Design brief:
Two copies of one chain form a homodimer. Chain A has three helices and seven strands, in the order ββαββββαβα. Chain A is an alpha+beta fold. Chain A has one domain: SH3 type barrels, CATH 2.30.30.110. In chain A, strands 1, 2, 3, 4, 5, 6 and 7 form a seven-stranded antiparallel β-sheet that branches. The longest helix of chain A has 14 residues. At the A-B interface, helix 3 of A face strand 6 and helix 2 of B. It is classed as hydrolase. The entry lists the keywords Toxin-Antitoxin, ribonuclease, persistence, hydrolase. It forms a dimeric assembly. E. coli MazF form III.
Chain lengths: ~110, ~100
């Protein structure tokens, strides 16, 4: 067997059990495969089903579900340790716009 | 008396209980509206590793680990202010985080 090392723009299911944490919840990964693999850690943002319309939300549409990425919520978590399964991936269009909102908050 | 909402470039001392110092990243207006900040933790023991960015002043030397950025609720975690990082320092940290998060 061989673990799944989260890759950028992957949408994963990660382990949080410690506001805006909860878990087990979905996140959109940010850091590239190279990093995540070596470090065993990854940068990612939490997602949710209920969009309240706050300004850093980025919508995610697909199949028969609609959900939202909260970009300001960027967190470096240890994906290996918490344990993570891969729910799917996000459109590059969607990923771009996330990172875009992150810039707004930093740099 | 009015509280202290932490600002970008500030060095805050915040106790993670998921203390310890961190360089704040997100701006005042946001950090204040949301009661949350972005920042990266810093340590005294530093070893060789790329996403370190070294903080220098007075007697102490330290390093911010640029690659671990966290969105933390600074109010509940009761953050207070130890000092302020040099701009050259902030930018550098920022730029590292870029290479990690980037654009494309």
């Amino acid at each position: 067997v061989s673990r799944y090392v989260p890759d950028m723009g992957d949408l994963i299911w990660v382990d949080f059990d410690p506001s805006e944490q909860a878990g087990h919840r979905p996140a959109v990964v940010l850091s590239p495969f190279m990093y995540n693999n070596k470090t065993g850690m990854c940068l990612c943002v939490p997602c949710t089903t209920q969009s309240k319309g706050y300004p850093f939300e980025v919508v995610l549409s697909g199949q028969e579900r609609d959900g939202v990425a909260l970009a300001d919520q960027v967190k470096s978590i240890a994906w290996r340790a918490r344990g993570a399964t891969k729910k799917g991936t996000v459109a590059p269009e969607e990923l771009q716009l996330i990172k875009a909102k992150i810039n707004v908050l930093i740099g």
